[PDB]
Amino acid sequence: HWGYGKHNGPEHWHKDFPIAKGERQSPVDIDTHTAKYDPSLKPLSVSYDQATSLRILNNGHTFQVEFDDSQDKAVLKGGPLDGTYRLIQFHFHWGSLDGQGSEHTVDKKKYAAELHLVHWNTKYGDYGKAQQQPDGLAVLGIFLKVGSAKPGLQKVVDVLDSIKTKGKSADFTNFDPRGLLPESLDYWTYPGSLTTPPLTECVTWIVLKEPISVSSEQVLKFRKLNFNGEGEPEELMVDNWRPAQPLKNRQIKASFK
Ligand SMILES: NS(=O)(=O)c1c(F)c(F)c(S(=O)(=O)CCO)c(NC2CCCCCCC2)c1F
Ligand SMILES: [Zn+2]
Fold first, then answer.
1. Quick one: which of 67, 144, 146, 199 has the fewest CB in 10 Å?
2. Candidates 63, 87, 194: which one to mutate for ligand 1, based on the most atoms within 8 Å of Cβ?
C-alpha cells in the first residue's frame, strides 16, 4: 500500500495514518544554532559487545538486520534515556544521488544515507507493547557521507545481492554493529515518531553529530536493491526517506557545546 513513490509516498501517508500530521513527527531538521546544550544529559551508553545478529531481510521498503532481543545482549542506556533499551534491528534510508537520502537534516544539509538502530524499552516487555507507549522506542541515528569505505559495513553490502527483492531473507549471524559507529557519541535528542507507517509517536530520537564515511561503491550497492518482489517489474529501492516534518512545540537538545 504505502511506499516512497509519487502515488503512495510520504505526501499520501496521512490518509491511512492520520498521525502523519501529529505534534511529534519525525524526522526533523536539526537547526544547530537553535538546539540547546543540556549539561545534564548523560553520555550515551552503547553496550553491543554481546550482540547476536540473526538475519537480514528486504522488507520492501528498506533492508533490516535483526537481532536476538530475548535477553539484554545489545542495549542502549544513558543519554536522555531512563532504563534499558534492547536492540531489535537496524536499517537504512538512502538516496538516488549522493546529495540526498538522510531523513534528518543538519542546518538543511542532507547526507547520502542514514542508519537507524532501533531499540525498545525493556519495561514494556516486547517491542509490540513498547510501540504503544510515548517512551517505548529509542532510535539511534547515524548519518552516512560518501568518502572512504566503512570496513564494518562491507559484510552488509556483500550479502545484499542475496536479498535483492521484497520478502527475501538470508542468515546474517555474527555481525558486530559496533563497526558501524563513528568515533564520537556526541548527539542531539528530541521526542518524535517512527518515520514509516504507522508513524506512531513512541520514539526518543538520538542522532549522532559525527557521520560515518562510506564509499561510493558501498552506497551504489544499496541502490541495486529492489522495492518489488521477485518476478515483478523492477523498481530500484532508492529515495526511501521521509522528508523533514514540522518541529512544532519541540526543543532539540544537544549533549555537546
Ligand atoms: N525510521 S524508523 O526507525 O522509525 C523505522 C523504519 F523506517 C522502518 F523502516 C522500520 S522497518 O525496517 O521495520 C519497516 C517498516 O516498518 C522500523 N522498525 C520498527 C517499527 C515497526 C514496528 C515494530 C517496532 C520496532 C521496529 C523503524 F523503526
Ligand atoms: Zn529508519
1. 146
2. 194
